[PDB]
Design a protein around this nucleic acid. Structure first.
Ligand SMILES: [Mg+2]
Ligand SMILES: [Mg+2]
Lengths: 252, 152, 66, 159
RNA sequence: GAUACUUUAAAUGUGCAAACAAACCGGCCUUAGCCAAC
RNA sequence: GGGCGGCAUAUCUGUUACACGACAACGCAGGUGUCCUAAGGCGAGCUCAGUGGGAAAUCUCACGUAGAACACAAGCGUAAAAGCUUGCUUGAUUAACGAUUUCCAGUACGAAUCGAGACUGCGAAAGCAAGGCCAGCGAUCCUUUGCG
RNA sequence: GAGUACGACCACACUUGAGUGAAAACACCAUAUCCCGUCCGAUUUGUGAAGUUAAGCACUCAAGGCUCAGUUAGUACUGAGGUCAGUGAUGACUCGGGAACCCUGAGUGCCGUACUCU
């Protein structure tokens, strides 16, 4: 049995890109995302990058440059305690809140905060975004999800809806939202609203308490004595808190 | 005589360098090309859309037209007793910005800086001297240059 | 019967010289260019012609005054 | 040592290489379903004809079926059965012998059992994002598979 | 390889430029062009 | 020499060919007049050829820079793909006489490149697609069909 | 002095074998009523936070590779010249240009935007 990785194997070997070897970036998709019309002589174009870790969610607005990407503005789901959310980070409701927080900070920085108020009312409805590609036009960015799989109900789309309701232009169809039915080809705003406000979390929490009454899941809720029938209200209050103080961050 | 196609005899011309395969990069994508710029036309063998004919593979010209994904370039070509100006259309993967005028632009910039300093009254740098003048040479080592028995 | 050679051809081509290319600023037509930019440039040129006519009239009036 | 190195049964695989496309293969497909409670999957040769049936059971069901097969095997196999990279297997010749009530519509089949063993943390080589290779200290040696064979469903290597 | 195909790589070549319809520095006019906007 | 034979008579790849381009011989080694409603278009998932250790061709683990595949000759090119499996589709339609390359007299034909408009396909989106990259084809007059 | 997210150049960054890892983070890890997907909650999708640096990762340390110099060497080859020498193959000379493998010496990533910890 001759060895494979012999002397002649290394001389003819070409290494892949650094981030391809680390398995972080899909360069084929990145090229199509950063590409722009050459007749638009380098006018600004923006990505909404969403990355979900094990214990946090990350969302930033990025413009690409030769020297390296620059971040216009970033928001993290881990600072939502400063607005009134705890014990329930990295879920669909926190995704919605993260998106809305990012949009509010971005419009506030770019100075168009009063215009494009977004949707002060919360609903899992669909409304096609207004774009020149089709009155002052709304600030626009395209969604970047990375290597994540784009299945119906995934949290990347909840993050997206957060910004859309915050008042951003992100082109999209409502085909990957939780309430969508593929065979009938329609969306259920009631179901989407339920997932936005976190009814399923409350149902699971009630079930686990009722079952564990006899003789590790949801341990922090059970320990801190969080009660059902308040989760929707807590999220609804957090939304107003953000729209009042978009920058109130974690202390010190 | 027997076979003369569009890509005939391009075995070594349209090939990638050793251990340098792959596809264009974001630096190529993010490059801005305007009408009136000098560019080099170099065929990228991994794209295969909008590739120029092999005659234009090493030439330099002027951009006359920009489209959403293409560039139009003017390139001189001698035919019999005259030089024609041919207009070729390519994808943006197959061009590069030319550095054929760097020295001239640098000369103009240095002239402007010199004019600014002369008007300001600042002291000018000391001008370089010639290397072909005479002088006294103080040697450190002297040797004997010779052809010896051991040499052969 | 079918001979081919290039023997005297360069000598023939250099008697009246290889002529240089036409300068870039002559024969600089835009036909076949990307359409939207062309359409905008035409409107700008029409406005410029109107301005040139007005400027000539003003110059003539000023000279008549003095 | 560290609790993270506890050897666990990753999965169990059941195979029937019938090699025939007729009704016997389909009856084997029925008995596999009635045995494992999960739908089996067919396998075609490299052609265009199905010639094998197999599964992949994971969990307490896998542990239970492994114990059941080891009962027939009398907890004794051969050392060469163990393989480098940590795994082993065997076969059963009379399917009803595994407590399956005989049905005349089918007959008897020569089932094959295979097992996979490893620690926890091997996800880093089947992940989609940042897929990498496990270190060698974390791997499982053939001697270690043999040693785990004892004191957990103890049996005789009978080398 | 077989038992000349090739990483490396000349000499001789070959394309472009080297301030007077060109290019450099600051106002201003116009566009039913790009950009969230200018 | 001519006859016999053959096609070097349209046409592609590697060589001949001499590091831009061009360059001949009944020079050398090979191809073409077809085939495909998918073997065309797009999105997603996956990794191939092969080697080693196991289990009464198939099942399993590790390695595997492409050593396989891409209708057919050859050369280039390609690895979260341009290969394989799969879902939906008909951009293989129409396209105001736009411009261009190859041959080249800077004529045509065949093939190809960059576009503007309509109507669409696939996709969450940016995008991609007016056949299968590059060989696979044809004047006047006459016949015949569509259109106003 | 570190970490994470997005990155430009794409081996001085790769392959193999070991040791160390403050706090933060990243990650293994627990689970399957709901959205969603499989023969299989393996992969993927949702909801979590008991445990762990064992692995991934980062740093450091020894070999194949890779990168930059030196030698090989004014050698091989080559533009120009002769009523040059030789039967010829070829060779030297005159005015110019000038390598490669092998061998050997050194090192083993670097530069941006945003937010965090000691
Ligand atoms: Mg179109
Ligand atoms: Mg007729």
């Amino acid at each position: 049995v001759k060895v494979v990785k012999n002397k002649a194997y290394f001389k003819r070997f070409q290494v892949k890109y650094r981030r391809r070897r680390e398995g972080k970036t899909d360069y084929h998709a990145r090229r199509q995302m950063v590409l722009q019309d050459k007749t638009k002589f380098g006018s600004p174009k923006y990505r909404l990058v969403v990355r979900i870790t094990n214990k946090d969610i990350i969302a930033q607005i990025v413009q690409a440059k030769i020297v390296g990407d620059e971040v216009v503005m970033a928001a993290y789901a881990h600072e939502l305690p400063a607005f009134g959310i705890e014990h329930g980070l990295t879920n669909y409701a926190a995704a919605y809140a993260t998106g809305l927080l990012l949009a509010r900070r971005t419009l506030a920085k770019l100075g168009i905060a009063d215009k494009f108020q977004g949707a002060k009312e919360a609903d899992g409805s669909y409304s096609a975004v207004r774009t020149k590609k089709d009155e002052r036009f709304p600030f626009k960015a395209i969604l970047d999800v990375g290597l994540a799989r784009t299945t119906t109900g995934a949290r990347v789309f909840g993050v997206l809806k957060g910004a859309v309701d915050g008042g951003m232009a992100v082109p999209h169809r409502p085909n990957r939202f939780p309430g969508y039915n593929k065979e009938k080809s329609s969306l259920d705003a009631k179901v989407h609203r339920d997932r936005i406000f976190g009814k399923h979390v409350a149902d699971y929490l009630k079930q686990v308490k009722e079952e564990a009454s006899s003789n590790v899941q949801f341990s922090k809720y059970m320990a801190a004595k969080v009660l059902p029938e308040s989760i929707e209200g807590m999220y609804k209050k957090a939304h107003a808190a953000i729209r009042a103080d978009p920058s109130k961050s974690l202390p010190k | 005589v027997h076979s003369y196609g569009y890509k005939s005899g391009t075995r070594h011309l349209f090939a990638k360098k050793f251990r340098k395969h792959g596809v264009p990069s974001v630096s190529t994508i993010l490059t801005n090309i305007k009408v009136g710029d000098y560019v080099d036309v170099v065929a990228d063998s991994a794209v295969r859309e909008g590739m120029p004919h092999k005659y234009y593979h090493g030439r330099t010209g002027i951009v006359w037209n920009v489209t959403p994904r293409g560039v139009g370039v003017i390139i001189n070509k001698p035919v019999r007793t005259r030089t024609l100006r041919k207009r070729i259309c390519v994808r943006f993967e197959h061009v590069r910005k030319s550095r054929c005028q760097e020295a001239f632009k640098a000369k103009e910039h240095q002239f402007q800086a010199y004019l600014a300093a002369k008007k300001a009254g600042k002291a000018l740098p000391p001008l370089q001297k010639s290397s072909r003048l005479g002088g006294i040479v103080r040697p450190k080592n002297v040797e004997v240059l010779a052809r010896r028995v051991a040499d052969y | 019967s079918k001979n081919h050679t290039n023997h005297n051809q360069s000598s023939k081509n250099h008697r009246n010289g290889i002529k240089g290319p036409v300068p870039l600023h002559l024969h600089n037509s835009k036909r076949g260019s990307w359409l939207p930019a062309l359409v905008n440039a035409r409107r700008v040129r029409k406005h410029n012609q109107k301005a040139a006519l007005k400027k000539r009239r003003e110059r003539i009036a000023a000279f008549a005054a003095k | 040592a560290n609790p993270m190195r506890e050897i666990v049964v990753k999965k169990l695989c059941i195979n029937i290489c019938v090699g025939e496309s007729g009704d016997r293969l389909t009856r084997a497909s029925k008995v596999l379903e009635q045995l494992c409670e999960q739908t089996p999957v067919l396998s075609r040769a490299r052609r265009n004809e199905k010639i094998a049936v197999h599964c992949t059971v994971r969990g307490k069901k896998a542990e239970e079926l492994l114990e059941k097969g080891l009962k027939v095997k009398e907890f004794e196999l051969k050392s060469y059965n163990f393989a480098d990279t940590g795994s082993f297997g065997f076969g059963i010749d009379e399917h009803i012998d595994l407590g399956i009530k005989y049905d005349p519509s089918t007959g008897i089949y020569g089932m094959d059992f295979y097992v996979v063993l490893g620690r926890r943390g091997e996800r880093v080589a089947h992940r989609k994002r940042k897929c990498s290779r496990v270190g060698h200290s974390h791997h499982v040696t053939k001697e270690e598979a043999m040693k785990w064979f004892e004191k957990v469903h103890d049996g005789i290597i009978f080398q």
